[PDB]
Scaffold this active site. Structure first.
Site, short mmCIF file in Angstrom:
data_model
loop_
_atom_site.label_atom_id
_atom_site.label_comp_id
_atom_site.label_asym_id
_atom_site.label_seq_id
_atom_site.Cartn_x
_atom_site.Cartn_y
_atom_site.Cartn_z
N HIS A 99 0.81 -1.22 0.00
CA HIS A 99 0.00 0.00 0.00
C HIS A 99 0.85 1.28 0.00
O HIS A 99 0.45 2.30 0.55
CB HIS A 99 -0.96 0.02 1.19
CG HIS A 99 -1.87 -1.17 1.28
ND1 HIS A 99 -3.19 -1.13 0.91
CD2 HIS A 99 -1.64 -2.44 1.72
CE1 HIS A 99 -3.75 -2.31 1.10
NE2 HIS A 99 -2.83 -3.13 1.58
N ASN A 172 -9.83 -3.39 3.53
CA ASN A 172 -9.69 -3.37 2.08
C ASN A 172 -11.07 -3.11 1.45
O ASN A 172 -12.09 -3.04 2.15
CB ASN A 172 -9.10 -4.69 1.56
CG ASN A 172 -7.58 -4.82 1.82
OD1 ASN A 172 -6.88 -3.82 2.05
ND2 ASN A 172 -7.08 -6.05 1.79
C1 HEM Z 1 -7.09 -8.93 5.76
C2 HEM Z 1 -5.90 -8.77 5.26
C3 HEM Z 1 -5.25 -7.47 5.28
C4 HEM Z 1 -5.77 -6.26 5.07
C5 HEM Z 1 -7.19 -5.91 4.76
C6 HEM Z 1 -4.70 -5.35 5.18
C7 HEM Z 1 -4.83 -3.98 5.00
C8 HEM Z 1 -3.82 -3.08 4.94
C9 HEM Z 1 -3.91 -1.75 4.58
C10 HEM Z 1 -5.14 -1.04 4.14
C11 HEM Z 1 -2.70 -1.20 4.69
C12 HEM Z 1 -2.34 0.23 4.38
C13 HEM Z 1 -2.48 1.16 5.58
C14 HEM Z 1 -2.08 2.59 5.32
O1 HEM Z 1 -2.69 3.31 4.59
O2 HEM Z 1 -1.13 3.07 5.86
C15 HEM Z 1 -1.84 -2.20 5.12
C16 HEM Z 1 -0.51 -2.03 5.38
C17 HEM Z 1 0.27 -3.06 5.82
N1 HEM Z 1 0.03 -4.34 6.16
FE1 HEM Z 1 -1.76 -5.19 5.78
N2 HEM Z 1 -3.55 -6.05 5.43
C18 HEM Z 1 -3.84 -7.26 5.52
C19 HEM Z 1 -2.97 -8.29 5.78
C20 HEM Z 1 -1.68 -8.14 6.14
C21 HEM Z 1 -0.82 -9.14 6.56
C22 HEM Z 1 -1.08 -10.60 6.70
C23 HEM Z 1 0.34 -8.53 6.83
C24 HEM Z 1 1.54 -9.16 7.30
C25 HEM Z 1 1.55 -9.78 8.43
C26 HEM Z 1 0.18 -7.18 6.59
C27 HEM Z 1 1.15 -6.26 6.77
C28 HEM Z 1 1.01 -4.94 6.43
C29 HEM Z 1 2.12 -4.03 6.50
C30 HEM Z 1 3.51 -4.34 6.92
C31 HEM Z 1 1.67 -2.86 6.12
C32 HEM Z 1 2.43 -1.59 6.04
C33 HEM Z 1 2.11 -0.84 7.31
C34 HEM Z 1 2.79 0.48 7.32
O3 HEM Z 1 3.84 0.66 6.77
O4 HEM Z 1 2.30 1.43 7.83
N3 HEM Z 1 -1.07 -6.99 6.32
N4 HEM Z 1 -2.58 -3.41 5.33
#
Ligand code: HEM
Ligand code: HEM
Lengths: 721, 724
Positions: A99, A172
């Site tokens: 993202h 999402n």
């Molecule tokens: C239901 C499944 C998931 C959804 C809906 C989801 C949703 C999101 C969203 C919307 C963001 C962006 C947030 C922003 O605008 O800053 C994000 C970032 C991220 N997610 Fe997920 N994610 C999911 C699963 C995962 C999984 C399994 C991981 C790993 C364990 C993960 C790791 C991350 C990481 C590392 C970021 C970056 C966070 C940051 O840098 O601020 N996510 N996720």
């Protein structure tokens, strides 16, 4: 002498003796909330102020390095230059690992009525409270310079700044995820990201390694179906749905647990682009979704969404033909309905993209009392990940002191130090202490101190996928069977275009083989498109049965199951000098009566002259704003205008393209001449022709309500445009 | 059951058996015989996972890579799962900051060879011996956009070449135009901030077409020369293989006798100079944002190796003040018809990376990275650059040991007394100060006659001061020089670049101030642009004084891309449009005629896999018409076959393919019934760029010879009317 002055210090006014996009404080200062008020202390106003170093020293000459003479060597003692370049050299921080590409805005949230029956969460207790929010929308695959209208999942992260803690709903725009267990996340992302040798391709899942992984991991197919559908190309962040995906818990004051799934339902309807149109748009406006959201806030077409909940009593957890703890399963709204419980309004753009949108930090582990986690093994791994990533992305463990990240309630604890510590503490840094009578103090649960719901835990320490998770095709099939026929075609289009760009043919055949377990018509259509011969055993692969007696669910279809709103849509008005001025006025006033924005595109910027002699302010050139950036096209009368447009290949092509993209085209009077001269079939339900401008526009608006002329799609494939 | 098996550990093979053009591959997979001394150094850091177990970073075999450790198959995930936490931790921290400029880039390995010893001008060891193959790594880039932005934007292109020489790593860090926008390093953040996306909304990506950029331009007329270059078609190159490169700055070379020559670096492509046209370039960013990156990588896999000759403008110290401009001014070029470019060596890029992040992303260039034999001049832009590249890399590459990252390592020794810092790889065991006696002062300073770097003792006389040199105050003569040297076609494209860009500028006074600046360059230039902007120029603006000639020059041929440079046929790409029923022998004779001149033919059909000819034979296709529009090719040819023509005539994209390739001035070849498709389109009487014939190899021959002109510029006036 005047050329000389441009390379000498600038001590005089440079300002000269419809409007551009501007920071939120400039454009909507009256839209406020508690969090925006907190941010004011960090805002600057350089009006009347001297240009200064970071240490407060006024600068006399921002045009020249200090040298050994006017033509000499630059001197190391020039600290002004070195401080300026140094800050410049270190502007960039790491982009989010997923993202990376995103856009942010402020607003507020209001609960309709207290939810005390289901949860103690403070921001869901008082309908009179305006809880501030910050929302970041994003794509998933692309890096931060990648295009808005790619085919992708869209991220949707809402930070609720509540009086008892900051709560993050990180979701999402689809109700399921690709994988079941967090351990697979880096495998899935590596597969979808650009391939590691050549870093190709950007912002696309259409390449070998993604489809390779899909083909070996059937759990992925459900969300693949969603992103292969037109859900993968939303028209606007204002017009998609939103989902937390995971089952969370909600605890009320009695200690009763309800299973919960979060939803956002857009007030402006759910609408999408079509693939060819989306792809063109990444070309002519890679900032389409960001700009549209920025401008919709400045227009007053404020993004609005209703927060929904599906509510499942604890004792009903095992009564479905799927695990509610499985993130590749959705809960069909026909079985468990979504109760709309509150409303979010986005009404203020940020002042500084980097300070606010880039630096904002969300995490699903950022819950508040009244909400709790479930044993969903995707969600459990997510809890670790968000805080950890932010350690390097935002440079340490004090990212919560970055102003966009600060709560608006107190936050006293015993943590200390770390890089770029803003707070200055003077009391005991350990609990229990007596030297400060043990303040800050633990809070009893009845006082709001967070506690975990005492769910039972029985089992064996093991690495094993729950047998109740092993169902990979029934929900993909349900989602397929719930689509209209036009939506099914675009699904087939999605798979075929993407697999078309897969080099290794065995990957494509292996994906098509997976499809034969979802629906045979789907597999057959994709196979035909890829020149793949399906064996008879494949045509006969066994299909899953109904889910709790369910084989369709109308809510799973964008166009049959959700509404299309006319308000806030955009209409291109093609006109050159000599256009009928009253026609334009009448079109404009009508568009405005329905909340639609008319944009005048002309062969040059500035103003055009009407045949009545009046001047008309132009919104941009035809060449600069192609048909993919508008919802519909209208062409007013005027002999000289029409004749100009017929000499203009772009203006002619504007009509051919909008036709092929199934859009409403209005033609007044001699304007029909232009359509008739083009290699286009005869007018259909979406070609509104008229002589009266007001009448034509009213009829033209009515055709827009349908979003697109789906019946045109067959002949559209033969159009040369 | 197989479905259960996909969520349990994968102990068996997954590759397919047998029965079955090639995907892009790490350079070690596709071109292992293209070697040099640097790649061999890098060989030590590579790994063959074949037959290896999946492991933690501590070397512990993993048994189940499909499940977190929980309390039960349906339970809570345990903190003690170090395998999970290690894997997610590393993933969580994959990204590093992008470059603050030129963040979007592609790299390739190669080698440089000097033609003859340059000893009478420089001691630089890599320019001494034609026998040696000096390894290089090149990174091409755009400027403004972030790492995900698109290849074929309108922008300056960066061109950085790292030469791993035997007495030091030398970085030649250049651009694809011969001047820069600004005169002094202190202005760089202002200019960059101006062109970058605007700070409130971060809009727009990979475009100068917005208010702040042209606000800056209108207030800083020194920018106008390099703005002419980028508004020309120089700003949208066909390929990194078909553009020029320049160091821009005057440097010095120093021979063994201490003599100084002022020089300027040039890269001249063997494959000629060819540019896209704007409408095409813009469409290209939509259907393939990776277009130049892909083309470069595929050119190397194809053996159409990028080839470039290094060139030198050489100016004796005594000639410094003889020109109608200051050679220390980086908004000034040295016209090649005043000082000619001497070709002195040849670079060939012949291997693609194995890991983009390891090699391309992590490479660090800096113009402070010179070698003995080369020195700096007093160019006030260059002087500031020396500071920035080292400084920026401290945060981008995580500290001051980024020289130990493999791609950055030199290939010669490098002992000194530096120590420690984040991620120190080398282990030192001797005295860490100089002078020392405990290790007899090793490593030791090296006398200049032994090759120890020395600065040439240029005189320095002035007063400490912040002042722009009076000799820099000439903003309009070289833009005028550049304009008068363009053909009328190139001139029109410059006007279209200004007009499209200023069309997207909201504040009208900014559009007017730019148009006003153009009146001091050429009145016709201003007037054309003002017409396209609805601006009426005053009588006093059309009587603004124009600058005079430059050392008697009003035109320089080398400043025209198409009048003054070569078009090369070899390596170009041709769409062969065909469906089921195509004349098989036509495709064979076409393919072989193209192969004859080294042109790559691509069969694009309504569906991937195989089409069957009327003869009955199967033909492997290169991809779909839909997935490969006409903007991705140099020219189009449509073989015969009544069933094929009949299919394409019902294909909206196949018909638009011809229309679009016609409007983009490309060559179109039609065989037999193919013309039936052409006449049914809204296109005029066939022109010099339409080749029609019944005999296939005959038609291909005439087709290939029409491709020689790159584009059909005479068609330009009619193409504007054609319905897109
Ligand atoms: C239901 C499944 C998931 C959804 C809906 C989801 C949703 C999101 C969203 C919307 C963001 C962006 C947030 C922003 O605008 O800053 C994000 C970032 C991220 N997610 Fe997920 N994610 C999911 C699963 C995962 C999984 C399994 C991981 C790993 C364990 C993960 C790791 C991350 C990481 C590392 C970021 C970056 C966070 C940051 O840098 O601020 N996510 N996720
Ligand atoms: C002659 C004018 C200039 C040219 C031709 C030029 C060329 C380049 C090129 C090609 C790159 C990309 C290198 C790569 O591939 O990694 C680059 C990067 C950079 N340039 Fe410039 N540059 C110029 C002026 C400046 C100035 C005036 C500054 C600042 C004082 C500056 C600072 C940088 C920085 C900080 C980077 C990023 C380097 C890195 O991250 O490793 N440049 N320049």
């Amino acid at each position: 002498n005047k050329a000389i002055s441009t390379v000498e210090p600038h001590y005089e006014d440079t300002a000269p003796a419809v409007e551009p996009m501007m920071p939120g404080s400039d454009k909507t200062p009256k839209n406020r909330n508690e969090k925006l008020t907190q941010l004011d202390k960090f805002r600057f106003a350089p009006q009347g102020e001297s240009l200064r170093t970071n240490q407060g020293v006024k600068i006399s000459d921002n045009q020249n390095s200090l040298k050994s003479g006017a033509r000499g060597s630059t001197l190391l003692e020039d600290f002004i230059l070195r401080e300026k370049i140094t800050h410049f050299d270190h502007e960039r921080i790491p982009e989010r690992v997923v993202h990376a590409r995103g856009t942010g805005a402020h607003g507020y949230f209001q609960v309709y009525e207290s939810l005390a029956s289901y949860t103690t969460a403070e921001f869901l207790q008082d309908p009179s409270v305006k809880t501030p929010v910050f929302v970041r929308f994003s794509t998933v695959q692309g890096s931060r310079g990648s295009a808005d209208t790619v085919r992708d999942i869209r991220g949707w992260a809402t930070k609720f700044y509540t009086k008892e803690g900051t709560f993050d709903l990180v979701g999402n725009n689809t109700p399921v995820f690709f994988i079941q267990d967090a351990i697979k996340f880096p495998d899935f992302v590596h597969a979808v990201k650009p391939e590691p040798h050549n870093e190709i391709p950007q912002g696309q899942s259409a390449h070998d390694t993604f489809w390779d992984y899909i083909s070996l991991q059937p759990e992925t197919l459900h969300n693949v179906m969603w992103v292969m559908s037109d859900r993968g190309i939303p028209r606007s962040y204002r017009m998609m749905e939103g989902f937390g995906i995971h089952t969370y818990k909600m605890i009320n004051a009695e200690g009763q647990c309800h299973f919960i799934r979060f939803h956002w339902k857009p007030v402006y309807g759910v609408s999408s682009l079509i693939w060819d149109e989306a792809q063109l748009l990444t070309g002519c406006d890679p900032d389409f979704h960001r700009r549209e959201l920025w401008e919709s806030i400045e227009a007053g077409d404020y993004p609005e969404y209703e927060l929904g909940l599906q509510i499942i009593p604890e004792e009903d957890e095992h009564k479905f033909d799927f695990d509610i703890l499985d993130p590749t399963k959705l809960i069909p709204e026909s079985l468990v309905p979504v109760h709309l419980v509150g409303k979010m309004v986005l009404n203020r753009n940020p002042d500084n993209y980097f300070s606010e949108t880039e630096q904002v930090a969300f995490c699903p582990g950022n819950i508040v009392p009244g909400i709790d986690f479930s044993d969903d093994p995707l969600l459990q791994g997510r809890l670790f990940s968000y805080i950890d990533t932010q350690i390097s992305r935002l440079g340490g463990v004090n990212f919560h002191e970055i102003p966009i990240n600060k709560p608006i309630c107190p936050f006293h604890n015993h943590q200390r130090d770390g890089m770029h510590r803003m707070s200055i503490s003077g009391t005991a840094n350990y609990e229990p202490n007596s030297i400060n009578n043990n303040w800050p103090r633990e809070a009893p649960p009845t006082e709001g101190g967070f506690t975990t719901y005492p769910q039972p835990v029985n089992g064996y320490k093991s690495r094993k996928r729950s047998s109740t998770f092993i169902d990979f095709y029934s929900q993909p099939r349900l989602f397929w069977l719930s689509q209209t026929k036009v939506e099914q075609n675009h699904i087939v289009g999605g798979f075929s275009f993407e697999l078309g760009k897969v080099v290794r043919p065995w990957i494509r055949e292996r994906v098509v083989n997976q499809l034969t377990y979802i629906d045979h018509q789907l597999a057959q259509s994709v196979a035909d498109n890829l020149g793949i011969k399906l064996s008879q055993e494949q045509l006969k692969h066994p299909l899953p049965g109904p889910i709790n007696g369910l084989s369709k669910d109308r809510s799973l279809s964008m166009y049959d199951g959700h509404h299309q709103i006319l308000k806030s849509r955009q209409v291109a008005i093609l006109a050159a000098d000599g256009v009928c001025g009253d026609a334009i006025d009448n079109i404009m006033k009508t568009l405005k009566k329905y909340g639609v924005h008319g944009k005048i595109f002309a062969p040059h910027v500035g103003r055009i002259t009407s045949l009545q002699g009046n001047e008309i302010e132009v919104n941009g050139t035809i060449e600069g704003n192609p048909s993919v950036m508008v919802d519909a096209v209208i062409i007013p009368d005027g002999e000289d205008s029409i004749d100009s447009l017929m000499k203009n290949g772009n203006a002619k092509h504007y009509v051919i393209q909008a036709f092929k993209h199934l859009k409403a085209i209005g033609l007044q009077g001699k304007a029909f001449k232009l359509y008739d001269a083009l290699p286009l079939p005869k007018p259909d339900e979406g070609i509104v022709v008229g002589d009266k401008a007001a009448d034509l526009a009213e009829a033209f608006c009515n055709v827009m309500r349908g979003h697109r002329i789906w019946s045109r799609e067959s002949v559209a494939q033969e159009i040369a445009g």
